[PDB]
């Protein structure tokens, strides 16, 4: 999945085949540094990719004066009443109007979606 780098030349490690022990080795093209990986999966491609933005929503959006606010949706963690909300705010989304919420209490930053 991710990119792993050689410790000698600090270049990308390409996958190379070990035709003796039937094992996967990551080797670079600059030096002869070898490795054994734990992912065991070279490549992964998901075409749905309906990523939940709760990973990508920052908790600092609560300081936006231009966002709507509601008090009928208390925070799950700290029980604070006021909570900002907004829409998906994502391009390349075929169809979405679901709301997202962020707690406005400082240092809480709870970001959920009912």
Whole-number Å distance between alpha carbons of 82 and 104: 6
Hey, which residues between 51 and 110 contact Zn ion (CB under 5 A)? 75, 78, 80, 103, 105, 108, 110
* Cα 68 to Cα 39, 54, 76, distances in angstroms: 43, 18, 19
> Residue 51 binds what, of Zn ion, other proteins, none (CB under 5 to 8 Å, by partner type)?
none
- Smallest CA-to-CA distance from 83 within 55, 64, 97 is with 64
Nearest residue to 84 via CA among 108, 50, 52 = 108
For the segment 20-39, give every residue that binds Zn ion (CB under 5 A).
Answer: 28, 30-31, 33
Please, which residue, 6 or 111, has the CB nearer to other proteins?
A: 111
Contact between 16 and Zn ion per CB under 5 A:
no
Q: Which of Zn ion, other proteins, none sits in contact with 75, Cβ below 5 to 8 A by type? A: Zn ion
> Binding site for Zn(2+): what residues are annotated?
6, 9, 28, 31, 75, 78, 103, 108
């Amino acid at each position: 999945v991710g990119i792993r780098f050689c410790q000698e030349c600090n270049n990308m490690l390409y996958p190379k085949e070990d035709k003796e022990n039937r094992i996967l080795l990551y080797a670079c093209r600059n030096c002869d540094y070898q490795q054994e990986a734990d992912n065991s999966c070279i490549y992964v491609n998901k075409i749905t990719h309906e990523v939940d933005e709760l990973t990508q929503i920052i908790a600092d959006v609560s300081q936006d004066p231009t966002l709507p606010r509601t008090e009928d949706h208390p925070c799950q963690k700290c029980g604070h009443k006021e909570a900002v909300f907004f829409q998906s705010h994502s391009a390349r989304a075929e169809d979405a109007m679901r709301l997202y919420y962020v707690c406005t209490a400082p240092h809480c930053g709870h970001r959920w979606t009912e």
